[PDB]
Amino acid sequence: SELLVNTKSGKVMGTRVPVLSSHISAFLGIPFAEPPVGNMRFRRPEPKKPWSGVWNASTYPNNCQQYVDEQFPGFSGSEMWNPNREMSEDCLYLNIWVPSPRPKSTTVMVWIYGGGFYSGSSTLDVYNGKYLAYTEEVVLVSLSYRVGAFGFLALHGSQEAPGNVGLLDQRMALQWVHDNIQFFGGDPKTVTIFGESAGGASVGMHILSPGSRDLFRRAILQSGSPNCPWASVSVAEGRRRAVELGRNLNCNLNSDEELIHCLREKKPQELIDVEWNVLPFDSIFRFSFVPVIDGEFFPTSLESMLNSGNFKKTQILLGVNKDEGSFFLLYGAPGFSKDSESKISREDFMSGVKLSVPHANDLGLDAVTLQYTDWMDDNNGIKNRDGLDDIVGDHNVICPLMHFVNKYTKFGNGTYLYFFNHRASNLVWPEWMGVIHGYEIEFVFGLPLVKELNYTAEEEALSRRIMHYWATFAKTGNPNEPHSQESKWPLFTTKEQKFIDLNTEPMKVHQRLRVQMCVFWNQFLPKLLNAT
Amino acid sequence: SELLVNTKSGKVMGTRVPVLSSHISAFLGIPFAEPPVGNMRFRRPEPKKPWSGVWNASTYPNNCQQYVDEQFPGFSGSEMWNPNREMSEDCLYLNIWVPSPRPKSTTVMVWIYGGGFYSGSSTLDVYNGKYLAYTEEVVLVSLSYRVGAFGFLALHGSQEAPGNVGLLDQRMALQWVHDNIQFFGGDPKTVTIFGESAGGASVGMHILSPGSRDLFRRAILQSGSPNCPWASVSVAEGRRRAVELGRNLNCNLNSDEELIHCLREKKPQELIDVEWNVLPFDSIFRFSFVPVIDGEFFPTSLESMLNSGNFKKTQILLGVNKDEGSFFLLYGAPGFSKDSESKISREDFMSGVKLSVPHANDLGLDAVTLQYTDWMDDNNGIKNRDGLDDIVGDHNVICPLMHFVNKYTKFGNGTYLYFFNHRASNLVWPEWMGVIHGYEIEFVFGLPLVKELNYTAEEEALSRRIMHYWATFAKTGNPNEPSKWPLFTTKEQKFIDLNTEPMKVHQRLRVQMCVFWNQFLPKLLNAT
Ligand SMILES: C[As+](C)(C)CCO[C@@H](c1ccccc1[N+](=O)O)C(F)(F)F
Ligand SMILES: C[As+](C)(C)CCO[C@@H](c1ccccc1[N+](=O)O)C(F)(F)F
Ligand SMILES: C[As+](C)(C)CCO[C@@H](c1ccccc1[N+](=O)O)C(F)(F)F
Ligand SMILES: C[As+](C)(C)CCO[C@@H](c1ccccc1[N+](=O)O)C(F)(F)F
Ligand SMILES: *[C@@H]1O[C@H](CO)[C@@H](O)[C@H](O)[C@H]1NC(C)=O
Ligand SMILES: *[C@@H]1O[C@H](CO)[C@@H](O)[C@H](O)[C@H]1NC(C)=O
Ligand SMILES: *[C@@H]1O[C@H](CO)[C@@H](O)[C@H](O)[C@H]1NC(C)=O
Ligand SMILES: *[C@@H]1O[C@H](CO)[C@@H](O)[C@H](O)[C@H]1NC(C)=O
């Protein structure tokens, strides 16, 4: 039967689901590892041991333990991102959507959810993989990885809490895909890992980590990059935070063994409630437990690896949104409300840069300020708001991604760059927030194809070509369909630096994406802060 | 007669000079100090000893010893600034233009030529005061002062070469005016000192210096302020330069006096031939011997004085030109030519910026570059040319003056700021230089009123309103005569455009760039 599959470790029984007046197979909650519970909390993932009988894969699994957001209870805009299942430490599962007539050996795309390495679920409505699996005829997989302290507490030197175990969870599901996707009609030599935000950084980190390299063919990064200021810490900082988490819990701090034995006894929520307490400064777009440059998952520093071409050389498709930082300013900066135009005053502008570039001396702060202020009209609330928005988006997403794209292209085999600037007609967030962090996702997954969601006809078309670019890239390594009458998305080269706009207007090609500001962030400020 | 005046130190006789089909009186080459020659080289000036008989003041005096520009032999554009009279260390004279018939006790304006303190003359054609004196019925006086080593060699502590003597020359000119201008029909109580460039910085220095404050009423600064980076040096830097000057001429360096005596022996030209050698950095818009903050003429640091408000509180009218830096880049930077559009490659731009901010470290240069570069079009030869032009003009003239204007206004009794951006229809320099440093002067001096100079009627109009603004401001402390030229206030920061079109009132003159040059970069270099 189409729904019953003999995987290496056991039988899996999926379920038939409707998709736009049709059907496709869905295998939900398939486990790829032993439950990281008990004395396993904080440790490297272990492979799921074989089971007898048939594993019921007709329902989504649990979401991993995480800080649930409660800023706007009941508001769909914020809660669509929260865990929609029971949060359990037993959460290492992956889901697969296989087109009906099971494909013989087709393209595979593995989705890696993002959420600052502190949150995220594979089960959210926006990650329903049926539309893309059905429409583009690909085997769509969404995996899951431990987040926060569970997946990232790093006491470098300890084999109980080495750090980067969340990244290792991802690697294991990728291995699982490599060892079993062939039984679902997937081609393990043609898999594309794609993710957004922490999911976008994770993808880049797999392109850098030797132990992950041969588990996938190509890569797609959305609004995320391995070198993002928030995507990783030094092993020192990692250890520091691990000890501070333990201090915050009255933990015996004698040795790593004792700190870990303590933390392992606390109930999950106990760790979450103190999670943000370990950060260095009051900030936005900064998360407590994230990947550590250990010299194992990451042989050396990310920049050293980038300069030496010590990474997987394949094709990559990647991009950013127009207003990546508004989501964060709304939550942590003064003057920002979802119920108002949020015209920011000079006073709150200052307060906001301080929160956005937490690790910058006053000379730094002045530079960022001078760089984004119109001193001819510095009391303009609209400009101050948009100025600060750009600051958070440029510093945390766009420039880090642009630095990575320029480094990678030197050694890569094909790079395609996009700029998502479409504001959805049915957006629930206020207009000032613009094209929000995470909002190209519903288009990558094809939610506009379902009528009852109210997207315009032009939004259905945008989604369809975005999904086609993604699937065609995953299939061939070039998002453009051979000999088509459509507009060409050109290769991004270190010389021409071309990229395109992803929106309703007829495609347009641009060059040097936000160079001016990114020379500032990627070149000047680092040098200014280095000279101290 | 009207051409024979009894001054306090002796008689003097001028001459009747024609002006626009009318006449006015001219007293030229009036000595106001003892010839600072021989032993008196580098020494403070000494008042002019009285004389018997009448002093012939019918012709212009010698010009002070200075580096003569030979970049364009015979080109009027640069030749018009070179000494047009025979040079001589005996050059402390002043000129006066008195409207005819002689006024009773009218407004007096005293011009202070500018040329980086290393050059300048009171006899240039663009300084002919007979037009302004006549058109606005004012007594116009042009002074002179020592430049280069002769006026600013500085061995602080010594008394044979104390430094700032060139300024004391200026102060003595003003003291002379104070004591005598009433004999020519001018009110010593309503004297305005105005000057351009290094002259403008001097005006500002006499506003700051306690010993100069009481000798004048108001002030006008044209493209220069006392805090300009090229305008002064510490006692140590002055001292360093003085000694290196000696090292260059194989002078004994064992002590202040031996050095000074050795330098006194040398001929004027020997000193000038090695004048530039003392500069600490290869650069542009930098001069060797300039004023020194000695704690005498200047009590404390300029900034310290500006902040505490330790300076003459009165009204000031000042401004700057559209492209102050073109002249400098043309003479010392690669890519710039007088016979081409001078499009600047990225590589020549990089050179240009290092020559422009000689004191900045790499981080600083980087910052200046980021600030003026269009990273989406960095090989645009025009954007790069203009960018450099703006760097030089903003760093050396505009922003130091905007810092002076905002500080002064805090205690002042009335500021009036302008932005001159008209390019003479008959400019002999290439179009890319724009509104060049020093080319507002001909308007202030009404040359556009003499037809043989081929300016346009619309320009004669600009000249006249400008001369009226200057004179009306001189006489009343207000350029307007009851759209009007609005007062500059730290709240609205308004200023006007000075050109042929109808007056426009703007606000916050080059605030973006100047926040960079006055606040950011300083704090950056200071830290690093
Ligand atoms: C496709 As998402 C990486 C779950 C867009 C928002 O998520 C941000 C965020 C930013 C600012 C405030 C709140 C949140 N949030 O609740 O998720 C974060 F943190 F997950 F990255
Ligand atoms: C004890 As808290 C006021 C949940 C520390 C971080 O707060 C952030 C934040 C809060 C919730 C999700 C994501 C973010 N973030 O990415 O910065 C902000 F924005 F509220 F300050
Ligand atoms: C040995 As030389 C070539 C007389 C040092 C300065 O030269 C300047 C210069 C020359 C003449 C007048 C002013 C300037 N200046 O302000 O920099 C420039 F431009 F040639 F490099
Ligand atoms: C009204 As003027 C202050 C005598 C014109 C500009 O003069 C500059 C200059 C700048 C670059 C090259 C040559 C010169 N120059 O011969 O005067 C300097 F140096 F005098 F200020
Ligand atoms: C799998 O479990 C779900 C939920 O309990 C149920 O709806 C489905 O029928 C189950 N499959 C079978 C028949 O085991
Ligand atoms: C990718 O690699 C192939 C074979 O090594 C080469 O022919 C092609 O030029 C490369 N493509 C790019 C754009 O790097
Ligand atoms: C005044 O000086 C001029 C020029 O030096 C000379 O030609 C003239 O004869 C002199 N007049 C008298 C009588 O001193
Ligand atoms: C100048 O000072 C006088 C006397 O105190 C004062 O009345 C006048 O308002 C001041 N003018 C300005 C514009 O500061």
Short mmCIF file of C-alpha atoms in Angstrom, two decimals, chain B residues 12-165:
data_model
loop_
_atom_site.label_atom_id
_atom_site.label_comp_id
_atom_site.label_asym_id
_atom_site.label_seq_id
_atom_site.Cartn_x
_atom_site.Cartn_y
_atom_site.Cartn_z
CA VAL B 12 50.04 112.45 4.72
CA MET B 13 48.77 113.25 1.22
CA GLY B 14 46.71 110.99 -0.93
CA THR B 15 45.49 111.30 -4.46
CA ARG B 16 42.25 111.80 -6.38
CA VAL B 17 41.35 108.57 -8.15
CA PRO B 18 38.56 108.19 -10.67
CA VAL B 19 35.76 105.76 -9.85
CA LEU B 20 32.84 104.91 -12.14
CA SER B 21 32.73 108.42 -13.68
CA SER B 22 33.15 110.13 -10.30
CA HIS B 23 36.11 110.52 -7.96
CA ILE B 24 37.09 109.54 -4.43
CA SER B 25 40.19 110.08 -2.30
CA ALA B 26 42.91 107.46 -1.94
CA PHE B 27 45.64 107.39 0.66
CA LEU B 28 48.01 104.56 -0.19
CA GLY B 29 50.93 102.94 1.54
CA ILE B 30 50.47 104.61 4.92
CA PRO B 31 53.11 103.18 7.29
CA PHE B 32 51.63 101.99 10.60
CA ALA B 33 54.67 100.25 12.13
CA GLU B 34 58.45 100.45 11.99
CA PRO B 35 59.89 98.44 9.08
CA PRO B 36 60.34 95.02 10.75
CA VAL B 37 63.77 94.48 9.20
CA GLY B 38 67.23 93.33 10.33
CA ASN B 39 67.21 92.82 14.10
CA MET B 40 63.45 93.32 14.03
CA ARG B 41 62.84 90.17 11.95
CA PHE B 42 60.39 87.82 13.79
CA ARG B 43 59.98 90.47 16.55
CA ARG B 44 56.68 91.99 17.59
CA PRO B 45 55.93 95.13 15.60
CA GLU B 46 56.98 98.54 16.93
CA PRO B 47 54.84 101.62 16.31
CA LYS B 48 55.78 103.89 13.40
CA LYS B 49 58.06 106.68 14.62
CA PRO B 50 56.59 110.12 13.82
CA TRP B 51 57.94 111.92 10.78
CA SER B 52 58.26 115.49 9.53
CA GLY B 53 56.99 116.74 6.20
CA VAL B 54 54.21 115.06 4.26
CA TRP B 55 54.23 111.35 3.55
CA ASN B 56 53.64 110.58 -0.11
CA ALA B 57 50.61 108.29 -0.09
CA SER B 58 49.79 108.35 -3.79
CA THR B 59 50.97 104.88 -4.61
CA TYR B 60 50.70 101.31 -3.35
CA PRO B 61 53.40 99.89 -1.07
CA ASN B 62 55.70 96.87 -1.33
CA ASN B 63 54.17 93.47 -0.57
CA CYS B 64 55.47 91.20 2.18
CA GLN B 65 57.96 88.43 1.39
CA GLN B 66 56.00 85.34 0.43
CA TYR B 67 56.02 82.12 -1.55
CA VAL B 68 55.14 83.12 -5.10
CA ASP B 69 52.82 80.72 -6.97
CA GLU B 70 54.31 79.59 -10.31
CA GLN B 71 51.96 76.68 -11.08
CA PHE B 72 50.51 78.52 -14.08
CA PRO B 73 52.94 81.17 -15.35
CA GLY B 74 50.82 83.90 -16.88
CA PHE B 75 47.43 82.44 -16.02
CA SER B 76 45.32 85.24 -14.57
CA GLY B 77 43.36 82.86 -12.35
CA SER B 78 46.32 82.27 -10.02
CA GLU B 79 48.51 85.16 -11.08
CA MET B 80 45.95 87.69 -9.79
CA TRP B 81 46.72 86.51 -6.25
CA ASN B 82 50.53 86.70 -6.47
CA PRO B 83 52.31 89.81 -5.17
CA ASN B 84 51.70 92.57 -7.76
CA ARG B 85 54.21 94.88 -6.12
CA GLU B 86 57.87 94.45 -5.27
CA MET B 87 58.32 92.25 -2.20
CA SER B 88 60.13 93.56 0.85
CA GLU B 89 60.30 92.88 4.62
CA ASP B 90 59.43 96.59 4.82
CA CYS B 91 55.79 95.93 4.05
CA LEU B 92 53.72 97.15 7.01
CA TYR B 93 51.53 99.73 5.30
CA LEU B 94 47.84 100.37 4.99
CA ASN B 95 45.59 101.91 2.34
CA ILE B 96 42.51 104.04 2.70
CA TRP B 97 39.71 105.06 0.36
CA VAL B 98 37.72 108.08 1.48
CA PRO B 99 34.51 109.08 -0.36
CA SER B 100 34.51 112.63 -1.76
CA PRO B 101 33.51 115.06 -0.43
CA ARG B 102 34.88 113.74 2.86
CA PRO B 103 32.26 112.28 5.20
CA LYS B 104 32.10 113.56 8.78
CA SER B 105 32.31 110.42 10.96
CA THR B 106 31.15 107.52 8.82
CA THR B 107 31.28 103.69 8.95
CA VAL B 108 34.75 102.15 8.55
CA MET B 109 35.59 98.72 7.12
CA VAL B 110 39.01 97.17 7.47
CA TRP B 111 39.99 94.36 5.08
CA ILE B 112 42.45 91.64 6.07
CA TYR B 113 43.68 89.67 3.04
CA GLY B 114 43.86 85.90 3.35
CA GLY B 115 46.28 83.38 1.94
CA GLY B 116 46.95 80.65 4.49
CA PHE B 117 49.15 83.02 6.55
CA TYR B 118 51.96 82.17 4.12
CA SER B 119 50.93 84.76 1.53
CA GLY B 120 48.62 87.60 0.50
CA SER B 121 48.79 91.31 -0.46
CA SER B 122 46.70 94.44 0.13
CA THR B 123 47.37 95.67 -3.38
CA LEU B 124 45.72 93.02 -5.55
CA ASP B 125 43.25 94.35 -8.14
CA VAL B 126 40.36 92.57 -6.43
CA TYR B 127 41.07 94.55 -3.29
CA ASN B 128 40.86 97.96 -4.95
CA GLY B 129 38.65 99.62 -2.36
CA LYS B 130 37.59 102.66 -4.44
CA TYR B 131 34.37 101.01 -5.71
CA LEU B 132 32.91 99.93 -2.35
CA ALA B 133 33.96 103.10 -0.58
CA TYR B 134 32.12 105.09 -3.30
CA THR B 135 29.07 102.87 -3.83
CA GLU B 136 28.27 102.62 -0.12
CA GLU B 137 29.81 105.87 1.12
CA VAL B 138 32.14 104.18 3.62
CA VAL B 139 35.80 104.65 4.57
CA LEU B 140 37.51 101.47 3.32
CA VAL B 141 40.85 100.46 4.81
CA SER B 142 42.97 97.51 3.70
CA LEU B 143 45.78 96.54 6.08
CA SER B 144 48.76 94.24 5.68
CA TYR B 145 50.70 91.84 7.91
CA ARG B 146 53.73 89.55 7.89
CA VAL B 147 53.16 86.07 6.47
CA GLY B 148 55.19 82.87 6.37
CA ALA B 149 58.13 82.55 8.79
CA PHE B 150 58.43 86.38 8.87
CA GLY B 151 55.08 86.69 10.55
CA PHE B 152 54.65 83.44 12.40
CA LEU B 153 57.96 81.73 13.21
CA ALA B 154 57.19 80.58 16.78
CA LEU B 155 59.76 79.85 19.51
CA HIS B 156 57.48 80.38 22.50
CA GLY B 157 59.31 81.63 25.55
CA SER B 158 61.90 83.46 23.48
CA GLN B 159 61.32 87.14 22.97
CA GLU B 160 63.12 87.61 19.64
CA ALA B 161 60.69 85.21 17.89
CA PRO B 162 57.58 84.81 20.14
CA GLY B 163 55.12 83.94 17.41
CA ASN B 164 51.88 85.56 16.27
CA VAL B 165 53.77 88.74 15.25
#
